[model samples]
Target: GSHIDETAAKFTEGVNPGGDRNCFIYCSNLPFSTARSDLFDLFGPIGKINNAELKPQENGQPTGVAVVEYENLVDADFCIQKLNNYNYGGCSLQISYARRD
Candidate 1:
């Protein structure tokens, strides 16, 4: 939303692994040094975010992966639909709902 450019969605849509409408999103291909605060800024303009966690790297290296949790299913869907190919700071984000049993 506010943190990204008006680029179109990138990847094809995919269903969540679980049947339920998920509130978590899996993101990859993030720019180097991406962190929770970056995600917070990216998603904060969109909706209520429950949490954001970047995949940890050994020895403080950069790991271009993250899971963002929304406060509701609708919020998650908004990101899933519109942020699939979001251009954030020169990195095209790959995103989808992260469903778990």
Candidate 2:
């Protein structure tokens, strides 16, 4: 198989690399109108939220990246299961584990 095929296979199950799950998940391809309450409205019912913050914008549009922190990694995983690729405000959300710094 080609390299492209190998890469595709590796990610066929989702893009969380190296099984590194965490309490924080990175959400991208979000609506420019996204807000903190919006994240709560979507993810709160599934689990407790520790924090939710969207990327900063200045004099222009947002970067479409939102970092949502849950009370536990299990809760974050559940949110991804129910919301990944879920359409909202005309955009498909891409949810993945946030890198541990």
Candidate 3:
């Protein structure tokens, strides 16, 4: 994450750890019960999935964060636009290129 300092204040020193907007989408607010297969199914036809990571806490609990990497930027754009407001397993997905770690 970077270049998100639209606010020209003293608190703008830190960087926003946003994902690579070229071919990556940061997914969050997902159900902890969500599986990797669920991601595969959603992005399968969009493009080749370079990598998909479901973050976990130190206590071994899911963080409800998933980073999806795609080989094609075009597909990434489409996926974000289409799935941003979508509901996955009843929880709305927060799909965006700019996301915190």
Candidate 3: deviation at residue 37, Å?
A: 1.6
In terms of TM-score, which candidate is strongest? 2
lDDT score for candidate 3 against the true structure: 0.67
**What shift in Å separates residue 79 of candidate 3 from its native position after superposition?**
1.3
Measured with C-alpha atoms, the lDDT of residue 50 in candidate 2 is 78
Sorted on TM-score, best first, the list reads 2, 3, 1
Model 1 C-alpha lDDT versus the unseen true structure:
0.68
Better of 1 and 2 by TM-score: 2
TM-score per model over all chains: 0.70, 0.72, 0.72
lDDT winner? 2
lDDT of each: 0.68, 0.69, 0.67
> Which residue pairs overlap in candidate 2's backbone?
none
Candidate 1 structure quality by residue, lDDT tens digits, 5-99: 22112211232333245677777788886656788777888899876666654486876777777887889888877888789778898887665
**Candidate 1 TM-score, true structure as reference:** 0.70
Residue 67 alpha-carbon offset, candidate 2, angstroms: 0.4
Clashes of 1: 0
lDDT of 2 by residue, 1-100 (tens): 4473443222222323223576767778988887667878877798888766665555657677777768877898998788887899989988877664
